[PDB]
């Protein structure tokens, strides 16, 4: 059976399954031609490029969906976060594994998507959401089942059918994605490369990606079947580079 081994960690998944390789690009290190930063980068490798498992969340019959900003999701997990804090520039790809398992007597379907540059809108049209509302490292922030009202002034318009980006949520498939259909599925694996217009960027100020898990067909089950179905997200940095060492801070 399939065994993906990054550093200390190893995920056992798939029965001849299929890993979605981002935009057809496998993550690679920054070349000396596409680079501007003149200082030699740090490549921790095994210490950083490993499977950090974020918090689990519960999929209940009404759950609208969840999202995590990628640079600010592993920000607190280990030496990835430490290098992130001590360096001014960073660049990494990811291997994202969304794990959800139910039984033959369960049903449901999740959309697992990776939105590069997921700029999200506000409820108060004259204001932009607050850092805390957009970011929830090790704390999945939730989509809502209904439109959020005005007057909140710095909340994210989490109406799921707009994906918090003012689009048709049913068109998110353009971004790299998989479906976890509990009928025939147990997990989803997406290998995302570095998606950005510049060769390197700061990892606190700019969340290059946003993982979204949105249930399109809700969880259901007959009485007796286990009622607590959790979803566990596990993200692994890949080909991480850091430039401009200095005094860390947050």
């Amino acid at each position: 059976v399939r065994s993906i081994t990054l550093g200390n960690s190893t995920i056992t998944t798939q029965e001849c399954a299929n890993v979605v390789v981002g935009y057809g690009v496998w993550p690679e290190y920054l070349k000396d031609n596409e680079a501007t930063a003149e200082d030699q980068p740090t490549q921790p490798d095994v210490a950083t490029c490993r499977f950090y498992t974020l918090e689990s969340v519960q999929w209940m019959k009404n759950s609208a969906g969840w999202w995590w900003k990628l640079p600010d999701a592993l920000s607190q997990m280990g030496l990835f976060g430490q290098n992130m804090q001590y360096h001014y520039l960073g660049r990494t790809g990811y291997t994202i594994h969304v794990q959800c398992n139910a039984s033959k007597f369960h049903q449901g379907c999740l959309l697992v998507v990776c939105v590069p540059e997921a700029e999200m809108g506000c409820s108060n049209l004259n204001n932009t959401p607050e850092f805390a509302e957009l970011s929830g490292g090790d704390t999945a922030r939730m989509f809502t089942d209904t439109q959020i009202g005005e007057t909140n002034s710095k909340k994210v318009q989490t109406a799921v059918w707009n994906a918090g980006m003012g689009v048709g949520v049913g068109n998110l498939t353009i971004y790299p994605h998989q479906w976890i259909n509990l009928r025939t599925n147990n997990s989803a694996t997406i290998v995302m490369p570095y998606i950005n217009s510049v060769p390197m960027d700061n990892m606190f100020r700019h969340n290059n990606l946003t993982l979204m898990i949105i249930p399109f067909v809700p969880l259901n089950y007959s009485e007796g079947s286990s009622p607590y179905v959790p979803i566990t997200v596990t993200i692994a940095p890949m080909c991480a580079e850091y430039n401009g060492l200095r005094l860390a801070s947050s």
């Binding site: 501007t36 930063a37 003149e38 200082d39 390197m200």
Partner: peptide, 27 residues
Amino acid sequence: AMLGTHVIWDVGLQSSCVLCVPWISQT
């Protein structure tokens, strides 16, 4: 300051010392 790009300049032999700030930018 020690954790960033720095240089120790002794006035002894080095009447003058050149610090060459590198180009470290996202763009």
